[PDB]
């Protein structure tokens, strides 16, 4: 047993490893959308940049969990990173609806994992997830929702071009 | 009864006073290690400086609890500060193992006291301890653990000299 | 058929996707080594930083291939990313030997893919791989080889500690 | 026989003169599109600026071949520059489709000429074309292709006006 370990349950630890894989899956999907919108027959560089940055943030989320695992005395165990669901992602509106459901999926995995820690009375881990994970998801979901509403307002064609310019700046 | 007092249980208050004394005990032990490594027959100024700073942080921890006690309407009641366990602390590796067990002791006293506050539904006090106490202990324990692992890697003699240079910068 | 496509053979295209997956696999193994050395019972932060940066570079390599794929009119197709071979990586010297064999694996794949492009007379793709991929692998293999030679010179114990300081500074 | 000449085949030399004329023809067509969009009944100053710059780049490409010709010991021989194919170029989307087919024509000629040099084992000339000509054509074709995709997204009318602002800014 690790010399750090104090108040850190086996179940919390494996949840972290589960969530790490979840973040990496999010990162992989976002990265696929990014280069999907870089395609010459899509050509939406603002959407492309928005998802590339979303990707880099999910990967940052994952490494902080890895860092946390070590801080508490857990051990990182990595699984395969499953490829994204689709190879093509449709219109800009389509990919953002996928993004919303993705972020909500991640939020649920995080809310479940907060439950494990509260159950085991892991107060520090609860605050860790409150401060560094749950608040980001709430902002991320609201922001993507706003995007969805705007993409429906402007419609297709010129409207989708104009919103892409908005993500590009 | 204090005009501040709201949602602050008698048991939470006396736990604070208990923890204050615990922090001061930590400060006193660290201060003893600091000047132990300042001895001419020990002469490890980097270890000396590491523990002197650890001491100053524990004392800062204690005064913030005193400040908190007053914020909530409690009353600070101070007890004797028991002298440290040992007068001499052995090698640099030895004193860090003592430090780890010390920090873990403090972490347990804090985790227990978080339980009192959660039990009394003292949400504000839980966040106070999450934000300002529990996260520091997790970082402090991990950092001391790393030190222990390194002190075993470099061994005694020149290796302990080299690590002391690392704490001195 | 993409309006971009000119002189871009379907076999070259599928190799890019192949190499993309290989780079991502390299990235994943380095990420694993990085947080392996961040463990409290390993505690080699220099080695940890070296592999975290190596990780970030492989992902950079992968995104430039995705970018290239789109430039030539190909289409990115992502596969799973297989978990790294090991969960623990031993000593600093051990993980570097793995890194050399990893880099050589990546170099071999890149060399094979340069063959596919020269066969199809894809001159631009050859220079792309020459300029942005083959030169880095040669430098990377040599640098890791130097690291291996040095880690054997200093031996274990204090010597592995000293080299970790060299990777950190 | 030039005192420079080494490993420079007469067929490579005559191809350079061939390509010089091709670059100048590209330059001339872009110059025509530029002032086509400066017409008061077209009035697309962004498109006009984009093609004026494209014009200036092709002439730059041509002068570097003349410069190269002299470096290797060849001799520049200039032919007529044929008027552009059209006098009017239609919509912004139309002229970009012409531009893509133009760039691909130039790319094809450059690829053929790279073949002539590799056959004659003119390694330096291959890298010259790889470094200074083939990479730019790949980027140019992709950028124009992106433009084509966007001009179809925004449609005509306001959409063509908005994209013109994007090329102007
Ligand atoms: Fe995330
Ligand atoms: Fe403390
Ligand atoms: Fe690589
Ligand atoms: Fe040109």
Automatic annotation (TrEMBL), chains A, B, C, D:
One of its GO terms (cellular component) is cytoplasm. Fe(3+) binds at residues 23, 58, 61. Mg(2+) binds at residues 23, 58, 61. GO terms for molecular function: ferric iron binding; ferrous iron binding; ferroxidase activity. Residues 6-155 form the Ferritin-like diiron domain. Keywords: Iron, Iron storage, Metal-binding, Oxidoreductase. This is Ferritin. The gene is fer. Fe cation binds at residues 23, 58, 61, 103, 137. It comes from Magallana gigas. It catalyses: 4 Fe(2+) + O2 + 4 H(+) = 4 Fe(3+) + 2 H2O. GO terms for biological process: intracellular iron ion homeostasis; iron ion transport. PROSITE patterns: FERRITIN_1 (PS00540), FERRITIN_2 (PS00204), FERRITIN_LIKE (PS50905). Its EC number is 1.16.3.1. CDD domains: Euk_Ferritin (cd01056). It holds the Pfam family Ferritin. Belongs to the ferritin family. Stores iron in a soluble, non-toxic, readily available form. Important for iron homeostasis. Iron is taken up in the ferrous form and deposited as ferric hydroxides after oxidation. InterPro entries: Ferritin, Ferritin-like, Ferritin-like_diiron, Ferritin-like_SF, Ferritin_CS, Ferritin_DPS_dom.
């Amino acid at each position: 047993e690790s010399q750090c370990r104090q108040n850190y349950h086996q179940e919390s630890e494996a949840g972290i490893n589960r969530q790490i894989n979840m973040e990496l899956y999010a990162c992989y999907t976002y990265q696929s959308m990014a280069y999907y919108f870089d395609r010459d027959d899509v050509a939406l560089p603002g959407f492309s940049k928005f998802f590339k940055n979303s990707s880099d943030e999910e990967r940052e989320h994952a490494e902080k969990l890895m860092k946390y695992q070590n801080k508490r005395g857990g051990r990182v165990v990595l699984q395969d990173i499953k490829k994204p669901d689709r190879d093509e992602w449709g219109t800009g509106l389509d990919a953002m609806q996928v993004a919303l459901q993705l972020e909500k999926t991640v939020n649920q995995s995080l809310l479940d994992l907060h439950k494990v820690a509260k159950s085991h009375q892991d107060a520090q881990m609860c605050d860790f997830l409150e401060t560094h994970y749950l608040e980001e998801q709430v902002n991320a979901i609201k922001e993507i929702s706003d995007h969805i509403t705007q993409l429906k307002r402007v419609g297709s064609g010129l409207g989708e071009y104009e919103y892409d310019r908005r993500l590009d700046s």
